[PDB]
Ligand binder design. Sequence first.
Ligand SMILES: [Zn+2]
Ligand SMILES: [Zn+2]
Lengths: 103, 50, 145, 383, 95, 97, 497
Amino acid sequence: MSWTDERVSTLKKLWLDGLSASQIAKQLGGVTRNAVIGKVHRLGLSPGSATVLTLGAHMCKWPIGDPSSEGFTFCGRRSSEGPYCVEHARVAYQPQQTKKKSG
Amino acid sequence: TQPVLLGITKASLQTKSFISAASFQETTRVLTEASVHGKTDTLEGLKENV
Amino acid sequence: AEAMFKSLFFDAERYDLSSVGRVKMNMRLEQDVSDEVRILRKEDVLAVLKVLVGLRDGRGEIDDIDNLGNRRVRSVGELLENQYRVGLLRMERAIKERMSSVDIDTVMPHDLINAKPAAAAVREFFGSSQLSQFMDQTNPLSEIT
Amino acid sequence: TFDQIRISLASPEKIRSWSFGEIKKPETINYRTFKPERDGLFCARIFGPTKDYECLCGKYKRMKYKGIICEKCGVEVTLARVRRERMGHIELASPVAHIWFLKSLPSRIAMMLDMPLKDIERVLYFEYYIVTEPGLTPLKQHQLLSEDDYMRAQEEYGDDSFTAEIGAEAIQNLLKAIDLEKEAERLREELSGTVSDMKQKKFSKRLKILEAFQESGNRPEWMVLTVVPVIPPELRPLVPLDGGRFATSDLNDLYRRVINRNNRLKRLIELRAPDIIIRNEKRMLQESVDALFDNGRRGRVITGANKRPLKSLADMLKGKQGRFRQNLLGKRVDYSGRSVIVVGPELKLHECGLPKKMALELFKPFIYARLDAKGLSGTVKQS
Amino acid sequence: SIGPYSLVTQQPLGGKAQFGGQRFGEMEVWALEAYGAAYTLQEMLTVKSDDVAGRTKVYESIVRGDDTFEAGIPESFNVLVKEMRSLGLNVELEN
Amino acid sequence: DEGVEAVFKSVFPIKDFNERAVLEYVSYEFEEPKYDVEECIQRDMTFAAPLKVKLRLIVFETEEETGARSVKDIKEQDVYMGDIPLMTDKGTFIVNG
Amino acid sequence: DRTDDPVRMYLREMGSVELLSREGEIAIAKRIEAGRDTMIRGLCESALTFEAIMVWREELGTGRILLREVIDLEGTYAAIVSAMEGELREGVMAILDAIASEFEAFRKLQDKLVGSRLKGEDLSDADRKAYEGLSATIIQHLKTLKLNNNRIEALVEQLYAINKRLIGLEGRLLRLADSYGISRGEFLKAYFGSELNPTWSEQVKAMGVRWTKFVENDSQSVTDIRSEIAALATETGVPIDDYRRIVQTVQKGEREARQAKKEMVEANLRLVISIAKKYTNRGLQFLDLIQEGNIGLMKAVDKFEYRRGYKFSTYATWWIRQAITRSIADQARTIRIPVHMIETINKIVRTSRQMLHEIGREPTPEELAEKLAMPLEKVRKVLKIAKEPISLETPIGDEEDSHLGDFIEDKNAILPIDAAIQSNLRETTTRVLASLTPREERVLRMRFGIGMNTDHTLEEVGQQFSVTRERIRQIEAKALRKLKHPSRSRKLRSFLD
Ligand SMILES: [Zn+2]
Ligand SMILES: [Zn+2]
């Protein structure tokens, strides 16, 4: 390897335009990976009834099927004050909620 | 208006210079009260010069 | 709310009452129950309320707190025992929390136990404590007084 | 010289003018080499150099020039005394209310705009929602809807002509929208020609606070401070004791916790976290801020290692290190001695016995001056 | 006569362990205020323990042979001003 | 009712409902002091005796509501504990020099 | 009802609104997948994202960012590291060869379309007959790409910037129009329906007869506003073609995805409290640990598929433990300590305890190096870390007074007796420098900064003096010899001793 005036110029140019630092020493030839890092550091400058589109407010959102499939829609019924519907609110959330602790 | 009497403890509560009041009394009520009003101490009393 | 009221006064570990306390309560109020129950009995509260209602009208004598009969002395034994009990409780909590991660099957002892989970609690008692103070070893009279 | 000491509220502009740099990293010193950090509490670039006439990184340690600034390092060469007269400021992502003007005996913020102290605590804790700028719809101003149903279900009156805010921003907007001249003129007319049974007891205090805020020149919005200044790195020292074990003051813990909570809130705001987590972060940050000043009004903040409560800035000036008897009034004095006393009948009334050991130490400079003038000695060091 | 000073307050240390200084208590200051003495109490609180800049000036004047001293401002007052500035309060000097 | 055995019999079993494992206490023994008082005063050590307690890891509870565990023989291992300072004949409690 | 507890209020708020769901996590994952699918379908448009990303695809052939950077390999491999990712290069090359025709198509037609939209002439089907097929082919080619998340994030960020510019323009229009009393619905719909016509601002004056009082300002603003927006659309933009719907579909998808993520992170909010309870009294408060665990949970909820672990808790516990342990070692230590240093300290402590318990009385640091296979200088430097410095307010005395801050000495302070000695030396040095000649005294005061703040070297003083370099040393030696006499240096000798 060499450290002539052209070596520092090409190194700075290749560090500025953008390229992997590991391949920088291989493209220059001779210089190792540790040398280029030290140079740059030393020198600096380092089905339902609604699809996924027609989903309005106060509607069911329980998915049916596979999203990566052909037919994937939601229920889309009267499901205000809740994301899911009443028919699925009891199957989604923990049924028979019985939990308590100290406070 | 006729004068009003008050104890020796409260005599320094409403004093003019806040530095003399902040020494003996609580520094919380004296500083917050004098902060909003922006009272300027003239360094007339003996406690301020010390 | 049910568990809170049950653990506040009717819990063994939460509400501890020494045998001396039970015997003192029996002497003050006859109950015929001592050295067997440590938690506050449901019948003791009614007896205390009845005694208070009786003393309110009269025919009763109050108990002074400065009386030497109502004061007990805690030597080094009871204090060190309480400190070791707190340390053992902390060690038990640590062991219960650590025993879930390691597989209990195909295991042995001496590994799921903290090396110094309670030794620091007993070392800090002699080191930093208002009771344990410097020794006044100036003469044979001070060593005994 | 100086006379006519004046104290008043400090605006954010004045705090920024006082500060030199903003601290962003809660790093006191390095573990391998004990030196200041780039943005830590102990920074040379912000609080001047550590050594006298010697910059860091060994570039301008000649001590011949004092106006130069090290390019690679980033700190100028200055005496160590400048490290005690340099302050720093901390930027806050969300406004916080001052603890002194909130939990004091007379509620200063409650005296303004006729607000009860019980209602202000709910808005600061992010429990309820306050309404401002009411339109022709229901839910008039100062409604303070408690349940969330009133904020969502009762909010079915259009997305406009209805503004509701929560937290310190609500108090800040209320203090910024309040007027002084109009309120003073309204209270002046109401005070004259009134039965003066119970309304006077509050009207007098309100008029007094309004007239104080008017002539003093301090706006009412300075109560909710936005930037907190940091004490210089000389009153909270980190001197290493004998044996390699350092010993720092308890003030570093509060600043470190405040910086950590501020950085956590800043990271939360960028990540777009839910409102439940962002609200708790703002609450914790406000608690850290108003506990760093007093630490007694709210719940006590005790360190996990030491069993004693931390001493904040307020508690440091009350009885222990304040100007009561520790530093200002009562202080240690040199050129003094102590010893037991005895009775002497031969001494006169104006004469007292003094041991030769105490007199030789108290009058050392006088003995040096006498030896210099008498001619029996030469150099001061020799004497 | 001259010993190690404090760390943050810049005052003489206390206690007979390492060259302690007899504390000039608050009640002792009232005794000087009772008398007409105003210069003894002024230098005993600023140039002896408080002032760090003018602390060496009095020693140099004593060793040279001229009795004179100058006190500009104690260090405790500066520390208190820096402490109050840390809070929301604005303590600025005038004139 | 007093002593380390008191608290040990108070709460001996460290049981967990998730895995149903318990630790049983049998007894504890005290070993001789490593350093005597005449050398503890000079070396600035701590006069104490190493405490040793025997604990069994075998638990009666097992899976499927069965009876005896798979390991019929108990573990019966000895675990080291932090030493406690002993009392001299004068009652000095020499923890340090 | 007063609490005075932030953590208590937090737990109350999380318990009064959250619940548990076994199969709800499956529905949340399906909703997140549907939102991602809708966002991808809305982002793959023409003249905005295809031509924008095609400038980077044209850079291919060098293997810098065309392959392994713009498209994820783990996804493409499933559809089918040095030894791997070989056929993926040929795959992306064939994909580029197939999309070259799609890029060549519509490239010369986008300019004509934007020009026709700017001029306002009604576009016929003569070009649409081919534009439909071109769009179908390009969308079919883009659907099979399955790019990574960074490229789609950059594209959606650029689209969001364009939408922010558009909404700023619309807000300026609304703030200029509402002074007369015009609504946003009718105004926006008229702007959308009459955007192609250049004289739409003047043609609407006939319908709005009441607008004549402000028509002059309306025109003088809206003509330049429409000119600016048209220039912005024709410079590096695609024609509208109901662009509001295309920009709102991606926004709706992102909103649905964010809502699903928030619901999923709020449902499992109480799971972090059980893990944070184990880590306590380690230098961090309970609320800070809860916040760090919430951060970890929110970071872990982004990546959750139908892998071997079908329970969200099994995958979230690892991230929560990592977030709690990674943050406890940074802030609670009170000093900057790296992660590798603390882990090495923990390993050394564990091995030392094990050796002390199963070998003998105490493990020596000499054998600790061979046991851990580390040098002696490293294992020796690992100890003596000075962790957890003592607080300065700790009461040294048994009572509350006599704190540790009083029993401390200040080393940087200089005693007055030392400063007094310096003045004497500074004065005696001037008196002793009176018998020497002026030349030697001047050269000595120049080389040694007695009365000068800046020091001068030999060459620096020689450049100002007659003697360049050599005789300066001789003069200094002569001056030093003159001062070595006991009669002349009698008083000065006491300073050194
Ligand atoms: Zn459904
Ligand atoms: Zn430097």
